[PDB]
Design a protein around this ligand. Structure first.
Ligand SMILES: [Zn+2]
Lengths: 313, 79
């Protein structure tokens, strides 16, 4: 009976020697099994496979612990989802545009390219080692692993239409945002004043206006009495803020923001581009790059640099 | 134990509505209720609680939802 030596893994760091019977499929021996993203569950070992590393699902305590320590998830299917994405993302191209890793268009991935470009421009430290490592490689220009992990964490598949805001929502859960703090005040001429403090993710995201300045000055929102109260920013402690709104024509002025998302289309179906403010305004559309001194277009999300802000109100 | 509780879900325009739920039931069941009440297809939005997005397959209890918690209904873009 012919056999071969292979290694199994869930993290590609800790390897586990296995001797496999060449007359049985990988699936019969390991369960779902992947070779560099390819599903080999129904395949029998090939001679050329000797000494290769295969991903398996975390099907015992040691692998469960390794997988949790690396990915900070215990969803048993996470690895399979990651591998399926990776089988595609390893085939995408990742052009360097103005020093940032982008993604050449494939598989309706404009939203991921915009998210990735954004991530490379805001100060954010991921908690799972998987994301730290993959982000380092993606900045080195090999972003396949990072993008497949994004898809896996968001429970989206390759080819699926995506939302940038939702993607960031998923990704921030896996970031160290503990020392982020936001203080808001809401003033109603009827009801009086109520201060609120927000921490972590809720401290860096707002949906309703694109303008950080407007958020500092005040936005009108409904109160529980029915009048219009004013919500304004009292204090901000974070390395960035994200201001979001339904897509609307908005003028981006060089030097007044970090980067922004543009959505052209309709809620049901549409297209993202990325705008970044450098020496001028650069519009990145996957591999494509254009530049301009001014900008007006359908913006949905704007990111701003921050350190510490306190109102004079 | 595991008695039904009422939570709030605030839509994209700002109106909250009450929903009787049980922490044992899945996010997807709450999502069906919200779709029915708001008249928005459940593919068109995602739910968040205290910033964290709610995954359809998990039971609401996984998220520490307490009586009169407010979930936020976020209109989703398909870019
Ligand atoms: Zn009021």
């Amino acid at each position: 009976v012919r056999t071969i030596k292979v290694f199994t893994t869930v993290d590609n760091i800790n390897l586990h020697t296995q001797v496999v019977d060449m007359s049985m499929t990988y699936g019969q021996q390991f369960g779902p099994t992947y070779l560099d993203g390819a599903d080999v569950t129904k395949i029998k070992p090939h001679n050329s496979h000797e000494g290769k590393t295969f991903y398996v699902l975390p099907n015992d305590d040691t692998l469960r612990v390794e997988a949790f320590e690396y990915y900070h998830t215990t969803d048993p299917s996470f690895l399979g989802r990651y591998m399926s994405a990776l089988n595609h993302t390893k085939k995408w191209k990742y052009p360097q545009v103005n020093g940032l890793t982008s993604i050449k268009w494939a598989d309706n991935n404009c939203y991921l390219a915009t998210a990735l470009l954004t991530l490379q421009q805001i100060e954010l430290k991921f908690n799972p080692p998987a994301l730290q490592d993959a982000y380092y490689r993606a900045r080195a220009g090999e972003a396949a692993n990072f993008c497949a992990l994004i898809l896996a964490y968001c429970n989206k598949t390759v080819g699926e239409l995506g939302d940038v805001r939702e993607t960031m929502s998923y990704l921030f859960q896996h970031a160290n945002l503990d020392s982020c703090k936001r203080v808001l005040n809401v003033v109603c001429k009827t009801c009086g004043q109520q201060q609120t403090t927000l921490k972590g993710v809720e401290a860096v995201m707002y949906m309703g206006t694109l303008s950080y300045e407007q958020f500092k000055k005040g936005v009108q929102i409904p109160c529980t009495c029915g009048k219009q109260a004013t919500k304004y920013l009292v204090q901000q402690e974070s390395p960035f803020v994200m201001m979001s709104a339904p897509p609307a024509q908005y003028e981006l002025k060089h030097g007044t923001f970090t980067c922004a998302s543009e959505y052209t289309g309709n809620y049901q179906c549409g297209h993202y581009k990325h705008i970044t403010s450098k020496e001028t305004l650069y519009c990145i559309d996957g591999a494509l790059l254009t530049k301009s001194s001014e900008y007006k277009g359908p913006i949905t999300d704007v990111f701003y640099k921050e350190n510490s802000y306190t109102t004079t109100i | 134990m595991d008695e039904p509780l009422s939570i709030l879900v605030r839509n994209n325009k700002g109106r909250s509505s009450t929903y009787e739920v049980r922490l044992t039931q899945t996010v997807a069941h709450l999502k069906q209720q919200v779709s029915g009440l708001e008249g928005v297809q459940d593919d068109l939005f995602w739910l968040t609680f205290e910033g964290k997005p709610l995954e359809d397959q998990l039971p609401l209890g996984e998220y520490g939802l307490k009586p009169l918690s407010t979930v936020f209904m976020n209109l989703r873009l398909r870019g």
